[PDB]
Design a protein around this ligand. Structure first.
Ligand SMILES: O=C(Nc1ccccc1)Nc1cccnc1
Ligand SMILES: O=C(Nc1ccccc1)Nc1cccnc1
Lengths: 304, 304
């Protein structure tokens, strides 16, 4: 019993973190096989960051200008290329701790673990979601760039995020491991505003299921609704529209609890309209939206 | 910027988790040097758990009755002893991944990371606090016993908790690594009720400091207070008394922000009396008390 915001165990990713230095900029790299992946802004002077021409900045850089340190041992860089907004540094040594891995591009509402690193050294692990506006609300200081987001499927690490940017509003932006930004963001020190940070409705519903499974049941009501009726109320409260695809994904939690998805929708509708009235659900005074249906099943079932 | 409930990177502890089986009970063990530590209730049939005599149950057990598996390799048990509520199984192989480590007994209000394990396999990592009633609010299913709580100081793992028990209220109880329960709990399937789960005031104040450092400032008010005045209001709201020792510990956050500890107390006093009025602080609608002053400094400064 009990329900926690839970990260994946980080060891497999800890074994991949290195330090990358270009001139006076130090940040983190991910060492998989004989490639080190890092943000291309490692080549920029904070002056460069105002209007960087990365192709032109890169002409001035050689393999020996990229200093890669794994623990307190230097890796030899034998090649470098830019792919979108990441650099790939080819090194002469395959990472001996390379786990089975994939690069995946996640969808908004998907959750992942972040291993926050400084100077190639892990500081902490926390759980994030890709927001509907393609930001994440992370915890990142200067030096944390190149920190990665990941999911684990038994022994396969799916890498989904590399940290690049803090927006003036202190929310976060980054890329997949092919160097493509999530959302409309660019690696330039310019005014970039996030769109509406809507609530991930399907995740709230999953977490209300988690709450019922763990004995927090006070919010269960006598009503049902329809997707169309729910969605009118959702839109008014800056919740993402619920689709039949989301209803299908909640089926296993519906089954386990015997609460129809549309009944839980009608419970959520009353919580939006009525508020919490100073009550809590799973120790929260707001509706949590950074657990996916898969996360709830995993944690409620004890997958390793 | 940003402030997250952050666990320590778990790799060093992942390398210590094993499976312990006694008859038909499987749970987790911690393998440090040539000793495997696990809950002594591994020897109980769920029937035994109603009124176990552990000394008498142990007479019936030999070294070869304790099956220890590290990955999919069996460890040879060459000795076993009971220390308080843990078993120490001596194995013929020192754990090659043993990190530098200490056993520490923490105080209520201290935070730690939990690596939730099943069958000796890590499932997730989350951050906990020792509650003032000596429970923790974890996420533990059957099979999670022997999962451990820890802090890391650079490369030294301080082990502070081993999971033993879920109370009928679905809160959690366990021991330090010398097998001594936190609080008045016993490893017996009997009615055990927790005391008042009071709020860890010094941790709330630390987190209000984190909030100011990260730009959440709306709750800062025009008032100050005294420890005695604050404490009258604290007691009324089931907050722990604040001591001059807590004020001293908050000094570095006072200094960084230039907000006197007693001014932040007076802000906290108005939040207790007035509520949040539907506002949030660092994405929370309630006052978070599972960050220590040390945690706030670590995360706000980027310690690895
Ligand atoms: O954003 C950063 N550098 C940068 C990137 C692109 C444009 C301009 C600047 N660093 C940073 C600091 C704190 C948290 N996360 C990231
Ligand atoms: O408490 C458990 N066994 C036990 C221990 C002492 C007395 C009676 C029973 N298992 C458990 C289950 C779920 C979460 N945490 C622990």
């Amino acid at each position: 019993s009990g329900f926690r915001k839970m990260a994946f165990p980080s060891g497999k990713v800890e074994g991949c973190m290195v330090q990358v230095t270009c001139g006076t900029t130090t940040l983190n790299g991910l060492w998989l096989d004989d490639v080190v992946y890092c943000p291309r802004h490692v080549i920029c002077t904070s002056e460069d960051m105002l209007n960087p021409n990365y192709e032109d900045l890169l002409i001035r850089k050689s393999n020996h200008n990229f200093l890669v340190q794994a623990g307190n041992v230097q890796l030899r860089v034998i090649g470098h290329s830019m792919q979108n907004c990441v650099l790939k540094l080819k090194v002469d040594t395959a990472n001996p701790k390379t786990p089975k891995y994939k690069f995946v591009r996640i969808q908004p509402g998907q959750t992942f673990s972040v291993l926050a690193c400084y100077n190639g050294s892990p500081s902490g692990v926390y759980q994030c979601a890709m927001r509907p506006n393609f930001t994440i609300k992370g915890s990142f200081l200067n030096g944390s760039c190149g920190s990665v987001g990941f999911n684990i499927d038994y022994d396969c690490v799916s890498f989904c995020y590399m940290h690049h940017m803090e927006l003036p509003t202190g929310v976060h932006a980054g890329t997949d491991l092919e160097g493509n930004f999530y959302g409309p963001f660019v690696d330039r020190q310019t005014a970039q505003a996030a769109g509406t940070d809507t609530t991930i409705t399907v995740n709230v519903l999953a977490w209300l299921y988690a709450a019922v499974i763990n004995g927090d049941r006070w919010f269960l009501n006598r009503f049902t609704t329809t997707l169309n009726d729910f969605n009118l109320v959702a839109m008014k409260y800056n919740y993402e529209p619920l689709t039949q695809d989301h209803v299908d994904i909640l089926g296993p939690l519906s089954a386990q609890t015997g609460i129809a998805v549309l009944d839980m929708c009608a419970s959520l509708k009353e919580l939006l309209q009525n508020g919490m009235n100073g009550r809590t659900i799973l120790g929260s005074a707001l509706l949590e939206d950074e657990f996916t249906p898969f996360d709830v099943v995993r944690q409620c079932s004890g997958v390793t």
